Amino acid sequence: DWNSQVIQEFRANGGRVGGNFEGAPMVLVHHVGRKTGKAAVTPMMYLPSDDDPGTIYVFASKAGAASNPAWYYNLTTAGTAQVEVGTETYAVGVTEVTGEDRDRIYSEQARRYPGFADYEKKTAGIRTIPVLALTRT
């Protein structure tokens, strides 16, 4: 609904959204419920890979809530997805980033948007915020 308006806005503005997402790199992630089988489209920020053209990182942050978001399980279950980035739409392979690599990519995101550091303080001792790599195929 809201979700719907953010998606229309993304698509009207070359892959950009205002409000809380003003100036941020956005992606619309098409995923499918690992239990329901139902398609959904979730807009979110990404961080582009500094090492590999065609790879973006997304953050299963869910505003520092207690649980991982449903899209996280949907993506890692399917192993592949479709995304809209910029004016494009393409298939992606999904892999989860872990260890010191996760920490480094999360630190760059939190550097650019320090709200991300608050999410991690909110989830301390509860969950580690997953980072996924979406790689263009």
Numbering used by the authors: 6 to 142
What does the article say, verbatim?
Herein, we describe the isolation and characterization of nine F420H2-dependent reductases (FDRs) from Mycobacterium smegmatis that utilize an F420H2 cofactor to catalyse the reduction of aflatoxins, leading to their spontaneous breakdown.
The three most active enzymes were from the FDR-A family (MSMEG_5998, 2850 and 3356). To gain further insight into the function of these newly identified enzymes, crystal structures of members of the FDR-A (MSMEG_3356) and FDR-B families (MSMEG_3380) were solved to 2.0 and 1.2 Å resolution respectively. MSMEG_3380 exists as a homodimer, while MSMEG_3356 is monomeric. Thus, it appears that MSMEG_3356 is the first characterized structure of a member of the FDR-A family. Despite their low similarity, the structures of both the FDRs described here are characterized by large hydrophobic pockets formed by several aromatic residues and a positively charged groove that is principally formed by several lysine and arginine side-chains. In terms of shape and electrostatic character, these pockets/channels are highly complementary to the F420H2 cofactor, which possesses an aromatic deazaflavin group and a long, negatively charged, side-chain consisting of a phospho-lactate and a variable number of glutamates. Consistent with the level of electrostatic and hydrophobic interactions implied by the docking results, titration curves of activity versus cofactor concentration show that both MSMEG_3356 and MSMEG_3380 bind F420H2 tightly, with apparent KM values in the nanomolar range (260 nM and 130 nM, respectively).
